Amino acid sequence: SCDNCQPGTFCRKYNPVCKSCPPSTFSSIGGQPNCNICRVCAGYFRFKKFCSSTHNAECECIEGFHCLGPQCTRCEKDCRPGQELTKQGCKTCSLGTFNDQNGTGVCRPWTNCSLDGRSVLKTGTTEKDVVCGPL
Numbered sequence: 001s002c003d004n005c006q007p008g009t010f011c012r013k014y015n016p017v018c019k020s021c022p023p024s025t026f027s028s029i030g031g032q033p034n035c036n037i038c039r040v041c042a043g044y045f046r047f048k049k050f051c052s053s054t055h056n057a058e059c060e061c062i063e064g065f066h067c068l069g070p071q072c073t074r075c076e077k078d079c080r081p082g083q084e085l086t087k088q089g090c091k092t093c094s095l096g097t098f099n100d101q102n103g104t105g106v107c108r109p110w111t112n113c114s115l116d117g118r119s120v121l122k123t124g125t126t127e128k129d130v131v132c133g134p135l
């Protein structure tokens with residue numbers, strides 16, 4: 001009987017009624033005995049999308065932070081030089097690659113100085129490219 005109810009309602013099998021979900025509460029599937037609690041977005045989080053009767057609120061991260069996980073359940077500090085922002089958060093550049101930008105950019109590979117005739121003056125790290133000699 002309660003299976004005839006649609007999303008944004010709750011319904012108890014002993015007394016079938018498709019009652020609207022109360023405030024700050026939702027249900028994406030209809031006709032369950034209770035509605036789920038709305039997620040509040042505060043502190044490091046802000047609302048991307050407000051809660052409605054049929055779907056949860058979605059959170060976003062404040063300035064200087066980015067979302068971590070599929071439901072943005074954690075914020076992570078924006079990455080430092082020597083790191084790139086992947087879809088799974090900040091990953092340190094692997095051996096042979098670098099990034100010199102703060103809070104942006106991607107891990108590029110080191111300049112091979114011997115593509116020209118040039119020699120290496122300075123070795124490479126995760127934050128600095130190798131420096132080559134004279135052309």
Ligand SMILES: *[C@@H]1O[C@H](CO)[C@@H](O)[C@H](O)[C@H]1NC(C)=O
Nearest residue numbers: 096110111112113114115120
């Ligand atoms: C640079 O290029 C040479 C010539 O193809 C290659 O053999 C070597 O592995 C490279 N070396 C570095 C340090 O990238």
